[PDB]
Amino acid sequence: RKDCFGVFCTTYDLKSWKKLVNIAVSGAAGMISNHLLFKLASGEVFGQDQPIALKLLGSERSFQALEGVAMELEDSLYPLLREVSIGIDPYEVFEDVDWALLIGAKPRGPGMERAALLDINGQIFADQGKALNAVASKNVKVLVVGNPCNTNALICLKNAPDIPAKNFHALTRLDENRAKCQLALKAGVFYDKVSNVTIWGNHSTTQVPDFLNAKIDGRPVKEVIKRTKWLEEEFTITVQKRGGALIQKWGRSSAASTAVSIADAIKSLVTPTPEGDWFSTGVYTTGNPYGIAEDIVFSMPCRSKGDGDYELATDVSNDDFLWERIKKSEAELLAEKKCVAHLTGEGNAYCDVPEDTMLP
């Protein structure tokens, strides 16, 4: 038996629970994973009637730590967590998974240009993409959190032609949640009265917090928040500096709240979207009606029936102020894309990307 860990080796499916769902998690020994795995195990993410299996992918260097995590899960006695496995080979960890939470990625190293980060992490996702294509479920949902998200996702799906491109996601939910918080604060209202908050573009400094389509208590934010300057200059920067402001305050990563956002991101795919609302997710653009370039992964407004899939939200309004920001982010993504042409199999690479675009 080499597919189970400790006490989890003793289970098997006990045929009102739904069939076991398999979830792979890269960067499994990381800080975000340390907060996320327990939320999943408790059933808060997929619901109380959904038992699950956790396939944790780590590395040779962090395998020890990976064992520590599995042991803490053993001591948590979560009744919905029926299976746990750990490993360093994605062709193994990924077999039969229905979800792939790809958090693993090399941090932006000292004096490491944007291009090198695109190539180093791109290679990692190109391989994980092949692993998923060979051993994972043909309908696996792949949620990318490892930076740079959008382009890593493009690379991943391009290396998994047998998996619908539509199934790949670059998470912008944390930034959506922060934008909504900032909006709520500004309008002096609680965050449960804010909706239709969209983050367009790639997960970087060019991301677009869209206030035009947002609502506060059912009304367009523009009629509630009159301060146009804040909306067009302060809002975005406030969102953009939140992660960085939490670095000096907290001292380190804001793991807890990003794990919360990853959970929300998943729930948005497995629960029907409340009428009129939507959620943000970096997704394959081919076919989009927003006039955005095709063949890339761009965060856009989406809603879901709760079947694990989604559709782009059409009841969206667009003005030049939004359009321009959307095309600017689009351009950065087209530049990133060409820069990884080798990994996508597009042909030959050409890199000319901005250096200070990494969201703090």
Catalytic residues: 203
CA separation for the pair 342, 26 (Å, rounded): 23
Helix (H) or strand (E) holding 142: strand 141-144
Residue 245 interaction partner, one of its own copies, Zn ion, none, beta carbon < 5-8 Å per kind? its own copies
Residue 33 marked in a binding site? yes
Cβ atoms of 41 and 73 within 8 Å: the answer is: yes
* 212 three-class SS: coil
Residue 245 marked in a binding site? no
Q: Which residues bind its own copies (CB under 8 A)?
A: 6-8, 10-11, 34-35, 37-39, 42, 44, 64-65, 67-69, 71-79, 174, 177-178, 180-181, 184-185, 188-192, 242, 245-246, 249-251, 254-257, 259-261, 264
* 190 three-class SS: coil
- Return the number of the residue (129 or 209) whose C-beta is nearest its own copies: 209
CB of 98 vs its own copies, minimal distance in Å: 22
- Return the number of the residue (72 or 311) whose C-beta is nearest its own copies: 72
**Long-range contact list for 65-68, CB < 8 A, 24+ apart?**
65/29, 66/28, 66/29, 68/29
Residue 64 interaction partner, one of Zn ion, its own copies, none, beta carbon < 5-8 Å per kind? its own copies
Instruction: Tell the burial category of 228 from Cβ atoms under 10 Å away from its Cβ (0-12, 13-18, 19+).
Output: exposed
Cβ atoms of 27 and 171 within 8 Å: the answer is: no
Residue 32 marked in a binding site? yes
Residue 177 interaction partner, one of Zn ion, its own copies, none, beta carbon < 5-8 Å per kind? its own copies
Residue 263 marked in a binding site? no
Cα–Cα distances (Å) from 165 to 57, 132, 336, in that order, read 23, 12, 18
CB of 130 vs its own copies, minimal distance in Å: 30
* 28 three-class SS: coil
Residue 69 interaction partner, one of its own copies, Zn ion, none, beta carbon < 5-8 Å per kind? its own copies
- Return the number of the residue (270 or 340) whose C-beta is nearest Zn ion: 340
Residue 61 marked in a binding site? no
Cβ atoms of 308 and 299 within 8 Å: the answer is: no
- Return the number of the residue (244 or 291) whose C-beta is nearest its own copies: 244
- Return the number of the residue (228 or 271) whose C-beta is nearest Zn ion: 228
Largest CA distance in the chain: 64
Residue 242 interaction partner, one of its own copies, Zn ion, none, beta carbon < 5-8 Å per kind? its own copies
Residue 27 marked in a binding site? yes
Residues near 262 by Cβ (< 8 Å), separated by ≥ 6? 32, 36, 101, 103, 143, 145, 171, 173, 174
Q: Which residues bind Zn ion (CB under 5 A)?
A: 3, 96, 149, 175, 203, 228, 295, 359
* 171 three-class SS: coil
CB of 155 vs its own copies, minimal distance in Å: 29
- Return the number of the residue (17 or 276) whose C-beta is nearest Zn ion: 17
* Nearest residue to 173 (alpha-carbon basis) of 231, 239, 81: 239
Gyration radius of the chain over CA positions: 20
Beta bridge partners of 23: 54, 99
Cβ atoms of 21 and 97 within 8 Å: the answer is: no
Residue 31 marked in a binding site? yes
Residue 111 interaction partner, one of its own copies, Zn ion, none, beta carbon < 5-8 Å per kind? none
CB of 182 vs its own copies, minimal distance in Å: 9
Residue with CB nearest Zn ion? 149
Tell me the CB-side half-sphere exposure of residue 334, using CA atoms within 13 A. Answer: 9
Residue 30 marked in a binding site? yes
Cβ atoms of 297 and 280 within 8 Å: the answer is: no
Binding residues for NADP(+): 27-33, 121, 128, 145-147
Known binding-site residue numbers for substrate: 108, 114, 147, 178
Which segments are annotated as binding site? 27-33, 108, 114, 121, 128, 145-147, 178
